């Protein structure tokens, strides 16, 4: 096989004795990228103001966020300097090397400001038109309010501030496509308020973090794209 082929090997010394992937000196074995990809990382972080929401703005969406196992497309503005100096996370970088996937994501949505009953809902097949989220008044007529019978979840920001949910993989096809260009992905995730708590005069600060589920798998290893060093920022 041409990728791993090694002709005429000239090796001066023996090979180095093994630590069982670090289990000898540390306690754990770092043998796999799928375990590194299950440590949570930031996904999208935004603010939402009154007045760029709906007119009536009782139980409505605040964000429809597209679920991609690679990241959303990043733009490194001056508001969140994360996306600027840290570039992408470890998950978009691991993901850019594989072609397909099959499996779900885990999310952690931390929506505060607001401190009322907030809700989340997964539309497994309404994909996949764009690489940004859509805020408030710009989400389309039929993604505006909650729907009936889509898998959803509800939480009082008074009891607890963090919603942690796991999105299933519901698709007709064999794979979902990593590195899509722009029914390929995991569909949409809608986040929204449950009935018109008055909004603080600055912001509802939402931030989504994500990871890989347990049954998730990266599937066909082609190359990595060209990278950019973070220390050059």
């Amino acid at each position: 096989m041409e990728r791993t082929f090694t002709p005429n090997v000239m090796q001066p010394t023996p090979l180095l004795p093994t630590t069982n992937d670090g289990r000898v000196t540390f306690g754990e074995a770092f043998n796999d990228l799928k375990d590194l990809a299950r440590r949570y990382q930031l996904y999208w972080e935004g603010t939402i103001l009154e007045g760029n929401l709906r007119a009536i703005r009782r139980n409505s969406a605040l964000v429809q966020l597209p679920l991609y196992p690679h990241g959303l497309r990043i733009q490194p503005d001056v508001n969140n300097p994360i996306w600027n100096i840290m570039r992408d996370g470890h998950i978009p970088v691991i993901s850019s090397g594989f072609r397909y996937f099959r499996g779900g994501l885990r999310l952690r949505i931390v929506v505060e400001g607001l401190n009322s009953c907030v809700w989340v809902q997964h539309h497994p097949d309404r994909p996949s038109i764009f690489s940004r989220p859509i805020i408030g008044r710009y989400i389309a007529a039929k993604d505006a309010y909650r729907n009936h019978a889509y898998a959803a979840y509800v939480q009082n920001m008074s009891v607890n501030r963090t919603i942690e949910v796991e999105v299933p993989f519901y698709q007709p096809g064999l794979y979902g496509m990593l590195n899509a260009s722009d029914f390929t992905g995991l569909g949409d995730l809608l986040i929204g308020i449950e009935g018109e708590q008055p909004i603080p005069k600055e912001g509802i600060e939402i931030s989504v973090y994500y990871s890989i589920a347990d049954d998730f798998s990266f599937n066909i290893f082609c190359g990595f794209p060209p990278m950019v060093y973070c220390d050059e920022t």
Binding site: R23, V24, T25, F26, G27, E28, F30, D35, L36, R39
Partner: protein, 54 residues
């Protein structure tokens, strides 16, 4: 099936943290910063003796 679970709700007394005094002969619930999850410790050998603090 989605049978109901009517079992009574137990009491429980909230506290902000575990014991500040205890140093021995017990477990300590904690949030470790590891990739692994589990009772894990750093490796040793003879290059590194046991603790000499007796």
């Amino acid at each position: 099936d989605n049978p109901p679970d009517p079992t009574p709700a137990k009491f429980f007394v909230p506290i902000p943290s575990h014991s500040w005094a205890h140093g021995t002969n017990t477990s300590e619930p904690t949030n470790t910063l590891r990739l692994d999850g589990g009772v894990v410790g750093v490796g040793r050998s003879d290059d590194i003796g046991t603790s000499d603090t007796a």
